[PDB]
């Protein structure tokens, strides 16, 4: 059967409502049940935002089981025709990182956020989705087709939960890269001016499509506002970004350059782990290299100065040195995943490892003077993987590196399998930077952060350690803590660790100084 | 004493909050009562939008009598230091035509809408108001100074109730006219692109300044802000705020801009003074009607309005005036109606139609003399002479000027205004490209006395055989509502039926009455 969808954006005082009308053929006139959209992206109770839900041209609608269900009575011939208005709260949805994002001059909804749940979700149907009566001056962008006025998709409901439909009037830019269309949309309040976001996004995409040398016929980049986060979801033909108003240019550039890079690496260049081995085996490559490339992309596009590039790798060396699993072998990392004690530190371990390995490999390849580079080698690796569905066996991947005079297999077995420390060549950041010894204080809170949190009572306070030195003593009524998680994205080294007891205590996590070769300028 | 204000615009999900910190000295340490802002522009219970209200640097606050009050505990020396956050609901405030206008990337507040009520409202103080930690890329404005970052005014609270403070991030344009600064701000959803709005506003504003060729204010702001179902504007010294709907057409705004902002000059600096005892409405035909004429001439000169659309506006005037029940009413009768609070839309609109057609006639007659005369040249002379008497001309001086240029102004005034005689427009008044031709226009006749009907709650005055009678309406039906019923309010469409829901059935018909012949201008 065919499902016809018509969506109208109706701008309001504080939001943009979506008037949705849908028509399809049922088998006969037996009253069937339909369900209101449930958010796969985390909003609790998405049905509360359905303002009205009535039938059209004779189709009757009554109450169903709960408030997420409706009983509709099809026509004798089987036609079903319904109309419902989605009025999403902009205030409530500011806390749902990937929920619906609406505003007085824009709207964005993922497939699950506006589509109706009818029947089997695995069943395939022909979806015709149109945007009608769009306001004057607005630009639209759908993930199912290059012309959001009408898309034609044959897929299942499940497939369509990740799709996107949106529009706005706050910033639009269009350009062509290799004859293919790319559309940029920016709505919401943002410190970075619209022109700087369009230029930066234009450069990042143009660089990405140059690397791998013709792609998608249509692609959209939608920037939408949400406080307290800088996140993005990637899709086929679209990249959606929910970011806070106070986002710095580099913060958005690093995210744009990293999440869009995931469409190639590991999207079209995946290293197949051996039989039975987990997907995390090659996280150093599928995540650490992507970040390295993302950094190399910004510096090439003249968006990130080389001095900041040095501090990004310096942070990788400092963060990996403070990682408690920095020396853990494959057998230990894989055992923690089967044992589910896999904290933020474990999540970040392969990012720090893989980024520095790529920096070393590039330096080692470019020192050859034969015009080689980690990038030239990744283009060969990706072109070869095209004849195998974008995947490469472990032997085929390391065979290529060995052909370019690079000991790829030895590095992986050393640093990833055996957990041996990673050495970065000194010429990696150009001749203007040189690694010089520096002492960085290790992260020692002076108390067991987890045993305390578990028992809600200060436990294991090491006498003479930082926590002891602040006055804290073991067995104390732990109330709360702030800036104590070392490997979550917002940890700051210049800010003290706060801990509240029954009284607020603050101290820096001072510990045995270690020496690291950080990159300095000349 | 000195009152010192600090305002922080804090963007939010659906609005922009205002963190206001105020510092002033009390006469003593004895507790005093301060009351939250009340809206002079019509917002019920504006205090409900005050989220927090606390003391600062040792000053204590407590509850007071009602929700509008607060008990402030000054310091021993008398120092009072308060901080309160205004978080205005953009949804409910869309219904208040002149209430606070906020939203995700902008804010606008009138003086009364953010300032605190401290002591006597007519006591003069020195108000120093600064906008701090404003968001990056936002542009701000104030009516108390050309630099919104810090203004300084010695005025009373009452004077400051009509002041304006605002900013935004959805559109800004600045330009200079004869060395003076003008800034334009646009926020909210609007069908007309920002470039079109800025170009038109710059053209209209420049045209108005060259018309009188006087040095305008050192700073001037024009703030376009969103609000459903209305197209309104409030004129202030140093600022013109406009709250309009998203679907506003360009000409609708162009007429609003050109008309409202001309009132700075006419009657602002050129008022005809009525004789002793006479109401100020006597010259509403000159202070409103002629302003509408010059606003239309202004738009055509700036190429924002074609000449075909100018003819229609005057055709509209002829039709609207012919439908006006008070069209032939003398001045004593129209002055009798103001004293009995009967001024309705028909009355407030009578002087608009009257004065605009007279201005059109007067211009044709002046230019027919072939001596380079024109109504615009005449108004330049009148404005210049008025500058020596305070923007004010006696009736004798005003009319002496017109009679000097061969125009019998006085005669028309005591024939069309004072006596209510019908107004004749010279056929050549719209140029050789247009000709007045007789057209038959159906008179407005609901077949029912609306005014009477709305005064009671039943149907009053249904004429057996009128349009309302044939539609099915009768004498004595519980009257509930009406749509498209006010003929002289801006929104009446002769092409949409008159809707009257009685009892509860809905009667929709056309208020078509006896035919009328009028000479409308048509293209050749
Ligand atoms: Zn990633
Ligand atoms: Zn007026």
PDB file of C-alpha atoms in Angstrom, chain B residues 175-438:
ATOM      1  CA  UNK B 175      22.627  54.683   7.457  1.00  0.00           C
ATOM      2  CA  UNK B 176      23.189  58.430   7.673  1.00  0.00           C
ATOM      3  CA  UNK B 177      20.859  61.224   6.553  1.00  0.00           C
ATOM      4  CA  UNK B 178      22.434  64.701   6.388  1.00  0.00           C
ATOM      5  CA  UNK B 179      25.034  63.636   8.942  1.00  0.00           C
ATOM      6  CA  UNK B 180      22.571  62.190  11.474  1.00  0.00           C
ATOM      7  CA  UNK B 181      22.365  58.522  12.426  1.00  0.00           C
ATOM      8  CA  UNK B 182      19.423  56.185  11.795  1.00  0.00           C
ATOM      9  CA  UNK B 183      19.344  52.534  12.852  1.00  0.00           C
ATOM     10  CA  UNK B 184      16.884  49.916  11.754  1.00  0.00           C
ATOM     11  CA  UNK B 185      16.148  46.700  13.674  1.00  0.00           C
ATOM     12  CA  UNK B 186      14.040  43.713  12.519  1.00  0.00           C
ATOM     13  CA  UNK B 187      13.292  40.594  14.565  1.00  0.00           C
ATOM     14  CA  UNK B 188      10.702  37.847  14.287  1.00  0.00           C
ATOM     15  CA  UNK B 189       9.215  36.015  11.332  1.00  0.00           C
ATOM     16  CA  UNK B 190       8.240  38.238   8.399  1.00  0.00           C
ATOM     17  CA  UNK B 191       7.300  37.372   4.822  1.00  0.00           C
ATOM     18  CA  UNK B 192       9.029  40.497   3.480  1.00  0.00           C
ATOM     19  CA  UNK B 193      12.811  39.901   3.354  1.00  0.00           C
ATOM     20  CA  UNK B 194      15.007  42.058   5.496  1.00  0.00           C
ATOM     21  CA  UNK B 195      16.638  43.755   2.518  1.00  0.00           C
ATOM     22  CA  UNK B 196      13.269  44.933   1.263  1.00  0.00           C
ATOM     23  CA  UNK B 197      12.312  46.230   4.659  1.00  0.00           C
ATOM     24  CA  UNK B 198      15.618  48.071   5.109  1.00  0.00           C
ATOM     25  CA  UNK B 199      15.620  49.626   1.629  1.00  0.00           C
ATOM     26  CA  UNK B 200      12.035  50.849   2.005  1.00  0.00           C
ATOM     27  CA  UNK B 201      12.618  52.223   5.508  1.00  0.00           C
ATOM     28  CA  UNK B 202      15.772  54.037   4.386  1.00  0.00           C
ATOM     29  CA  UNK B 203      13.904  55.513   1.410  1.00  0.00           C
ATOM     30  CA  UNK B 204      10.932  56.598   3.442  1.00  0.00           C
ATOM     31  CA  UNK B 205      12.979  57.995   6.234  1.00  0.00           C
ATOM     32  CA  UNK B 206      15.187  59.957   3.904  1.00  0.00           C
ATOM     33  CA  UNK B 207      12.270  61.336   1.964  1.00  0.00           C
ATOM     34  CA  UNK B 208      10.705  62.628   5.121  1.00  0.00           C
ATOM     35  CA  UNK B 209      13.842  64.395   6.170  1.00  0.00           C
ATOM     36  CA  UNK B 210      14.401  66.083   2.867  1.00  0.00           C
ATOM     37  CA  UNK B 211      10.723  67.102   2.686  1.00  0.00           C
ATOM     38  CA  UNK B 212      11.194  69.530   5.584  1.00  0.00           C
ATOM     39  CA  UNK B 213      14.997  69.671   5.112  1.00  0.00           C
ATOM     40  CA  UNK B 214      15.566  70.229   8.786  1.00  0.00           C
ATOM     41  CA  UNK B 215      18.251  68.612  10.909  1.00  0.00           C
ATOM     42  CA  UNK B 216      16.700  65.441  12.269  1.00  0.00           C
ATOM     43  CA  UNK B 217      17.505  63.944  15.658  1.00  0.00           C
ATOM     44  CA  UNK B 218      21.102  62.964  16.338  1.00  0.00           C
ATOM     45  CA  UNK B 219      19.953  59.343  16.705  1.00  0.00           C
ATOM     46  CA  UNK B 220      16.816  57.509  15.602  1.00  0.00           C
ATOM     47  CA  UNK B 221      15.726  53.869  15.757  1.00  0.00           C
ATOM     48  CA  UNK B 222      13.064  51.926  13.928  1.00  0.00           C
ATOM     49  CA  UNK B 223      12.277  48.567  15.611  1.00  0.00           C
ATOM     50  CA  UNK B 224      10.148  46.039  13.733  1.00  0.00           C
ATOM     51  CA  UNK B 225       8.880  43.391  16.151  1.00  0.00           C
ATOM     52  CA  UNK B 226       6.462  40.478  15.672  1.00  0.00           C
ATOM     53  CA  UNK B 227       2.849  40.203  16.805  1.00  0.00           C
ATOM     54  CA  UNK B 228      -0.085  38.330  15.274  1.00  0.00           C
ATOM     55  CA  UNK B 229      -3.186  39.975  13.911  1.00  0.00           C
ATOM     56  CA  UNK B 230      -2.098  43.564  14.195  1.00  0.00           C
ATOM     57  CA  UNK B 231      -0.099  46.129  12.254  1.00  0.00           C
ATOM     58  CA  UNK B 232       0.556  48.908  14.762  1.00  0.00           C
ATOM     59  CA  UNK B 233       3.216  51.425  15.691  1.00  0.00           C
ATOM     60  CA  UNK B 234       4.060  53.700  18.601  1.00  0.00           C
ATOM     61  CA  UNK B 235       5.877  56.933  17.770  1.00  0.00           C
ATOM     62  CA  UNK B 236       8.346  58.311  20.311  1.00  0.00           C
ATOM     63  CA  UNK B 237      10.995  61.020  20.250  1.00  0.00           C
ATOM     64  CA  UNK B 238      14.155  59.226  18.915  1.00  0.00           C
ATOM     65  CA  UNK B 239      12.354  55.948  18.039  1.00  0.00           C
ATOM     66  CA  UNK B 240       9.479  54.376  16.165  1.00  0.00           C
ATOM     67  CA  UNK B 241       8.461  50.880  17.318  1.00  0.00           C
ATOM     68  CA  UNK B 242       6.279  48.770  15.023  1.00  0.00           C
ATOM     69  CA  UNK B 243       4.526  45.557  16.071  1.00  0.00           C
ATOM     70  CA  UNK B 244       3.243  43.778  12.965  1.00  0.00           C
ATOM     71  CA  UNK B 245       2.121  40.345  11.809  1.00  0.00           C
ATOM     72  CA  UNK B 246       4.244  37.953   9.770  1.00  0.00           C
ATOM     73  CA  UNK B 247       1.876  38.083   6.775  1.00  0.00           C
ATOM     74  CA  UNK B 248       2.142  41.876   6.419  1.00  0.00           C
ATOM     75  CA  UNK B 249       2.287  43.052   2.809  1.00  0.00           C
ATOM     76  CA  UNK B 250       4.959  45.611   1.830  1.00  0.00           C
ATOM     77  CA  UNK B 251       2.503  48.405   0.987  1.00  0.00           C
ATOM     78  CA  UNK B 252       0.683  47.839   4.290  1.00  0.00           C
ATOM     79  CA  UNK B 253       3.923  48.525   6.168  1.00  0.00           C
ATOM     80  CA  UNK B 254       5.050  51.307   3.814  1.00  0.00           C
ATOM     81  CA  UNK B 255       1.826  53.205   4.503  1.00  0.00           C
ATOM     82  CA  UNK B 256       2.179  52.632   8.251  1.00  0.00           C
ATOM     83  CA  UNK B 257       5.776  53.888   8.209  1.00  0.00           C
ATOM     84  CA  UNK B 258       5.191  56.910   6.075  1.00  0.00           C
ATOM     85  CA  UNK B 259       2.058  57.985   7.890  1.00  0.00           C
ATOM     86  CA  UNK B 260       3.032  57.444  11.530  1.00  0.00           C
ATOM     87  CA  UNK B 261       6.506  58.845  11.225  1.00  0.00           C
ATOM     88  CA  UNK B 262       5.219  61.940   9.460  1.00  0.00           C
ATOM     89  CA  UNK B 263       3.326  62.901  12.641  1.00  0.00           C
ATOM     90  CA  UNK B 264       6.697  63.995  14.029  1.00  0.00           C
ATOM     91  CA  UNK B 265       6.361  66.891  11.582  1.00  0.00           C
ATOM     92  CA  UNK B 266       2.628  67.235  10.946  1.00  0.00           C
ATOM     93  CA  UNK B 267       1.120  68.240  13.597  1.00  0.00           C
ATOM     94  CA  UNK B 268       4.205  67.755  15.708  1.00  0.00           C
ATOM     95  CA  UNK B 269       5.822  70.900  14.390  1.00  0.00           C
ATOM     96  CA  UNK B 270       2.898  72.342  12.403  1.00  0.00           C
ATOM     97  CA  UNK B 271      -0.351  72.357  14.306  1.00  0.00           C
ATOM     98  CA  UNK B 272      -3.252  74.533  13.345  1.00  0.00           C
ATOM     99  CA  UNK B 273      -4.452  76.116  16.581  1.00  0.00           C
ATOM    100  CA  UNK B 274      -8.254  76.080  16.960  1.00  0.00           C
ATOM    101  CA  UNK B 275     -10.136  79.119  18.278  1.00  0.00           C
ATOM    102  CA  UNK B 276     -10.704  79.488  22.005  1.00  0.00           C
ATOM    103  CA  UNK B 277     -12.869  76.728  23.455  1.00  0.00           C
ATOM    104  CA  UNK B 278     -12.918  74.647  20.397  1.00  0.00           C
ATOM    105  CA  UNK B 279     -11.934  71.026  20.543  1.00  0.00           C
ATOM    106  CA  UNK B 280      -8.626  69.843  19.191  1.00  0.00           C
ATOM    107  CA  UNK B 281     -10.466  67.674  16.693  1.00  0.00           C
ATOM    108  CA  UNK B 282     -11.379  70.616  14.504  1.00  0.00           C
ATOM    109  CA  UNK B 283      -8.510  70.238  12.268  1.00  0.00           C
ATOM    110  CA  UNK B 284      -8.345  66.436  12.260  1.00  0.00           C
ATOM    111  CA  UNK B 285      -8.818  66.734   8.502  1.00  0.00           C
ATOM    112  CA  UNK B 286      -5.495  68.555   8.219  1.00  0.00           C
ATOM    113  CA  UNK B 287      -3.559  66.755  10.941  1.00  0.00           C
ATOM    114  CA  UNK B 288      -4.717  63.277   9.850  1.00  0.00           C
ATOM    115  CA  UNK B 289      -6.187  63.590   6.356  1.00  0.00           C
ATOM    116  CA  UNK B 290      -3.419  65.626   4.775  1.00  0.00           C
ATOM    117  CA  UNK B 291      -0.811  63.477   6.489  1.00  0.00           C
ATOM    118  CA  UNK B 292      -2.275  60.436   4.728  1.00  0.00           C
ATOM    119  CA  UNK B 293      -2.106  62.309   1.414  1.00  0.00           C
ATOM    120  CA  UNK B 294       1.541  63.301   1.862  1.00  0.00           C
ATOM    121  CA  UNK B 295       2.322  59.754   3.001  1.00  0.00           C
ATOM    122  CA  UNK B 296       0.971  58.443  -0.308  1.00  0.00           C
ATOM    123  CA  UNK B 297       2.822  61.098  -2.320  1.00  0.00           C
ATOM    124  CA  UNK B 298       5.924  60.125  -0.416  1.00  0.00           C
ATOM    125  CA  UNK B 299       5.617  56.499  -1.308  1.00  0.00           C
ATOM    126  CA  UNK B 300       5.006  57.200  -5.004  1.00  0.00           C
ATOM    127  CA  UNK B 301       7.979  59.577  -5.146  1.00  0.00           C
ATOM    128  CA  UNK B 302      10.236  56.914  -3.595  1.00  0.00           C
ATOM    129  CA  UNK B 303       8.975  54.429  -6.244  1.00  0.00           C
ATOM    130  CA  UNK B 304       7.600  52.190  -3.470  1.00  0.00           C
ATOM    131  CA  UNK B 305       4.025  52.604  -4.757  1.00  0.00           C
ATOM    132  CA  UNK B 306       2.846  52.683  -8.319  1.00  0.00           C
ATOM    133  CA  UNK B 307       0.523  55.355  -9.655  1.00  0.00           C
ATOM    134  CA  UNK B 308      -2.157  52.828 -10.406  1.00  0.00           C
ATOM    135  CA  UNK B 309      -2.212  51.862  -6.756  1.00  0.00           C
ATOM    136  CA  UNK B 310      -2.364  55.545  -5.777  1.00  0.00           C
ATOM    137  CA  UNK B 311      -5.604  55.940  -7.739  1.00  0.00           C
ATOM    138  CA  UNK B 312      -7.161  53.036  -5.895  1.00  0.00           C
ATOM    139  CA  UNK B 313      -6.366  54.517  -2.505  1.00  0.00           C
ATOM    140  CA  UNK B 314      -8.270  57.672  -3.460  1.00  0.00           C
ATOM    141  CA  UNK B 315     -11.075  55.563  -4.922  1.00  0.00           C
ATOM    142  CA  UNK B 316     -11.189  53.845  -1.650  1.00  0.00           C
ATOM    143  CA  UNK B 317     -11.527  57.162   0.067  1.00  0.00           C
ATOM    144  CA  UNK B 318     -14.409  58.221  -2.119  1.00  0.00           C
ATOM    145  CA  UNK B 319     -16.239  54.933  -1.515  1.00  0.00           C
ATOM    146  CA  UNK B 320     -15.533  54.867   2.227  1.00  0.00           C
ATOM    147  CA  UNK B 321     -16.653  58.488   2.598  1.00  0.00           C
ATOM    148  CA  UNK B 322     -19.800  57.895   0.534  1.00  0.00           C
ATOM    149  CA  UNK B 323     -20.645  55.010   2.879  1.00  0.00           C
ATOM    150  CA  UNK B 324     -19.961  57.138   5.969  1.00  0.00           C
ATOM    151  CA  UNK B 325     -23.217  57.938   7.823  1.00  0.00           C
ATOM    152  CA  UNK B 326     -21.730  61.225   9.103  1.00  0.00           C
ATOM    153  CA  UNK B 327     -20.468  62.392   5.698  1.00  0.00           C
ATOM    154  CA  UNK B 328     -22.815  65.408   5.492  1.00  0.00           C
ATOM    155  CA  UNK B 329     -22.747  66.262   9.208  1.00  0.00           C
ATOM    156  CA  UNK B 330     -21.867  69.838  10.127  1.00  0.00           C
ATOM    157  CA  UNK B 331     -19.089  70.632  12.645  1.00  0.00           C
ATOM    158  CA  UNK B 332     -21.525  71.398  15.344  1.00  0.00           C
ATOM    159  CA  UNK B 333     -22.999  67.912  14.906  1.00  0.00           C
ATOM    160  CA  UNK B 334     -19.593  66.271  14.894  1.00  0.00           C
ATOM    161  CA  UNK B 335     -18.565  68.296  17.873  1.00  0.00           C
ATOM    162  CA  UNK B 336     -21.801  67.247  19.543  1.00  0.00           C
ATOM    163  CA  UNK B 337     -20.753  63.607  19.125  1.00  0.00           C
ATOM    164  CA  UNK B 338     -17.426  63.958  20.832  1.00  0.00           C
ATOM    165  CA  UNK B 339     -19.056  65.395  23.856  1.00  0.00           C
ATOM    166  CA  UNK B 340     -21.312  62.453  24.070  1.00  0.00           C
ATOM    167  CA  UNK B 341     -18.596  59.882  23.696  1.00  0.00           C
ATOM    168  CA  UNK B 342     -20.128  58.644  20.424  1.00  0.00           C
ATOM    169  CA  UNK B 343     -16.894  58.816  18.548  1.00  0.00           C
ATOM    170  CA  UNK B 344     -16.803  55.536  16.676  1.00  0.00           C
ATOM    171  CA  UNK B 345     -14.717  54.232  13.901  1.00  0.00           C
ATOM    172  CA  UNK B 346     -16.903  56.034  11.429  1.00  0.00           C
ATOM    173  CA  UNK B 347     -16.206  59.322  13.132  1.00  0.00           C
ATOM    174  CA  UNK B 348     -12.489  58.863  13.474  1.00  0.00           C
ATOM    175  CA  UNK B 349     -12.290  57.896   9.907  1.00  0.00           C
ATOM    176  CA  UNK B 350     -14.512  60.733   8.599  1.00  0.00           C
ATOM    177  CA  UNK B 351     -11.698  63.284   8.866  1.00  0.00           C
ATOM    178  CA  UNK B 352      -9.272  60.886   7.148  1.00  0.00           C
ATOM    179  CA  UNK B 353     -11.381  60.542   4.042  1.00  0.00           C
ATOM    180  CA  UNK B 354     -12.388  64.134   4.036  1.00  0.00           C
ATOM    181  CA  UNK B 355      -8.873  65.658   4.424  1.00  0.00           C
ATOM    182  CA  UNK B 356      -7.161  63.345   1.940  1.00  0.00           C
ATOM    183  CA  UNK B 357      -9.602  64.137  -0.874  1.00  0.00           C
ATOM    184  CA  UNK B 358      -9.371  67.837  -0.162  1.00  0.00           C
ATOM    185  CA  UNK B 359      -5.605  67.684  -0.336  1.00  0.00           C
ATOM    186  CA  UNK B 360      -5.835  65.943  -3.694  1.00  0.00           C
ATOM    187  CA  UNK B 361      -8.216  68.647  -4.897  1.00  0.00           C
ATOM    188  CA  UNK B 362      -6.070  71.457  -3.473  1.00  0.00           C
ATOM    189  CA  UNK B 363      -3.024  70.144  -5.259  1.00  0.00           C
ATOM    190  CA  UNK B 364      -4.773  70.003  -8.608  1.00  0.00           C
ATOM    191  CA  UNK B 365      -6.005  73.483  -8.200  1.00  0.00           C
ATOM    192  CA  UNK B 366      -2.670  74.838  -7.144  1.00  0.00           C
ATOM    193  CA  UNK B 367      -0.809  73.163 -10.019  1.00  0.00           C
ATOM    194  CA  UNK B 368      -3.528  74.236 -12.469  1.00  0.00           C
ATOM    195  CA  UNK B 369      -2.435  77.853 -11.927  1.00  0.00           C
ATOM    196  CA  UNK B 370       0.791  77.185 -13.837  1.00  0.00           C
ATOM    197  CA  UNK B 371       2.884  79.258 -11.412  1.00  0.00           C
ATOM    198  CA  UNK B 372       5.043  76.408 -10.116  1.00  0.00           C
ATOM    199  CA  UNK B 373       2.772  76.092  -7.088  1.00  0.00           C
ATOM    200  CA  UNK B 374       1.975  72.786  -5.390  1.00  0.00           C
ATOM    201  CA  UNK B 375       0.610  71.521  -2.096  1.00  0.00           C
ATOM    202  CA  UNK B 376       4.037  70.237  -1.060  1.00  0.00           C
ATOM    203  CA  UNK B 377       5.617  73.626  -1.730  1.00  0.00           C
ATOM    204  CA  UNK B 378       2.862  75.180   0.296  1.00  0.00           C
ATOM    205  CA  UNK B 379       3.467  72.910   3.256  1.00  0.00           C
ATOM    206  CA  UNK B 380       7.151  73.760   3.227  1.00  0.00           C
ATOM    207  CA  UNK B 381       6.272  77.459   3.589  1.00  0.00           C
ATOM    208  CA  UNK B 382       3.752  76.747   6.354  1.00  0.00           C
ATOM    209  CA  UNK B 383       6.214  74.664   8.302  1.00  0.00           C
ATOM    210  CA  UNK B 384       8.916  77.307   7.957  1.00  0.00           C
ATOM    211  CA  UNK B 385       6.627  80.128   9.223  1.00  0.00           C
ATOM    212  CA  UNK B 386       5.371  77.917  12.081  1.00  0.00           C
ATOM    213  CA  UNK B 387       8.942  77.449  13.375  1.00  0.00           C
ATOM    214  CA  UNK B 388       8.781  81.126  14.490  1.00  0.00           C
ATOM    215  CA  UNK B 389       5.624  80.598  16.592  1.00  0.00           C
ATOM    216  CA  UNK B 390       6.305  77.087  17.969  1.00  0.00           C
ATOM    217  CA  UNK B 391       5.066  74.795  15.214  1.00  0.00           C
ATOM    218  CA  UNK B 392       1.696  76.481  15.734  1.00  0.00           C
ATOM    219  CA  UNK B 393      -0.352  78.584  13.306  1.00  0.00           C
ATOM    220  CA  UNK B 394      -3.529  80.480  14.075  1.00  0.00           C
ATOM    221  CA  UNK B 395      -6.458  79.741  11.784  1.00  0.00           C
ATOM    222  CA  UNK B 396      -6.115  83.224  10.290  1.00  0.00           C
ATOM    223  CA  UNK B 397      -2.403  82.860   9.523  1.00  0.00           C
ATOM    224  CA  UNK B 398      -2.889  79.415   8.019  1.00  0.00           C
ATOM    225  CA  UNK B 399      -5.544  80.546   5.661  1.00  0.00           C
ATOM    226  CA  UNK B 400      -3.824  83.754   4.787  1.00  0.00           C
ATOM    227  CA  UNK B 401      -0.989  81.677   3.342  1.00  0.00           C
ATOM    228  CA  UNK B 402      -3.250  79.568   1.169  1.00  0.00           C
ATOM    229  CA  UNK B 403      -5.145  82.587  -0.084  1.00  0.00           C
ATOM    230  CA  UNK B 404      -1.800  84.185  -0.969  1.00  0.00           C
ATOM    231  CA  UNK B 405      -1.098  81.282  -3.353  1.00  0.00           C
ATOM    232  CA  UNK B 406      -4.470  81.633  -5.102  1.00  0.00           C
ATOM    233  CA  UNK B 407      -6.156  78.811  -3.157  1.00  0.00           C
ATOM    234  CA  UNK B 408      -9.500  79.423  -1.433  1.00  0.00           C
ATOM    235  CA  UNK B 409      -8.668  77.327   1.617  1.00  0.00           C
ATOM    236  CA  UNK B 410     -10.952  79.106   4.080  1.00  0.00           C
ATOM    237  CA  UNK B 411     -13.956  78.729   1.783  1.00  0.00           C
ATOM    238  CA  UNK B 412     -13.563  74.956   1.581  1.00  0.00           C
ATOM    239  CA  UNK B 413     -13.064  74.700   5.345  1.00  0.00           C
ATOM    240  CA  UNK B 414     -16.384  76.375   6.157  1.00  0.00           C
ATOM    241  CA  UNK B 415     -18.094  74.453   3.354  1.00  0.00           C
ATOM    242  CA  UNK B 416     -16.802  70.894   3.703  1.00  0.00           C
ATOM    243  CA  UNK B 417     -15.762  70.778   7.360  1.00  0.00           C
ATOM    244  CA  UNK B 418     -17.924  73.306   9.062  1.00  0.00           C
ATOM    245  CA  UNK B 419     -20.941  72.864   6.901  1.00  0.00           C
ATOM    246  CA  UNK B 420     -20.431  69.321   5.685  1.00  0.00           C
ATOM    247  CA  UNK B 421     -20.908  70.071   2.102  1.00  0.00           C
ATOM    248  CA  UNK B 422     -19.943  67.355  -0.445  1.00  0.00           C
ATOM    249  CA  UNK B 423     -16.305  67.401  -1.545  1.00  0.00           C
ATOM    250  CA  UNK B 424     -15.510  67.685  -5.256  1.00  0.00           C
ATOM    251  CA  UNK B 425     -12.165  66.448  -6.588  1.00  0.00           C
ATOM    252  CA  UNK B 426     -10.896  68.106  -9.756  1.00  0.00           C
ATOM    253  CA  UNK B 427     -10.876  65.533 -12.592  1.00  0.00           C
ATOM    254  CA  UNK B 428      -7.240  66.163 -13.434  1.00  0.00           C
ATOM    255  CA  UNK B 429      -5.969  65.561  -9.921  1.00  0.00           C
ATOM    256  CA  UNK B 430      -4.287  62.275 -10.608  1.00  0.00           C
ATOM    257  CA  UNK B 431      -2.439  63.447 -13.727  1.00  0.00           C
ATOM    258  CA  UNK B 432      -3.322  62.983 -17.399  1.00  0.00           C
ATOM    259  CA  UNK B 433      -2.922  59.199 -17.050  1.00  0.00           C
ATOM    260  CA  UNK B 434      -6.205  58.841 -15.113  1.00  0.00           C
ATOM    261  CA  UNK B 435      -9.793  59.897 -15.774  1.00  0.00           C
ATOM    262  CA  UNK B 436     -12.753  59.909 -13.390  1.00  0.00           C
ATOM    263  CA  UNK B 437     -15.595  57.816 -14.741  1.00  0.00           C
ATOM    264  CA  UNK B 438     -19.030  57.238 -13.254  1.00  0.00           C
TER     265      UNK B 438
END
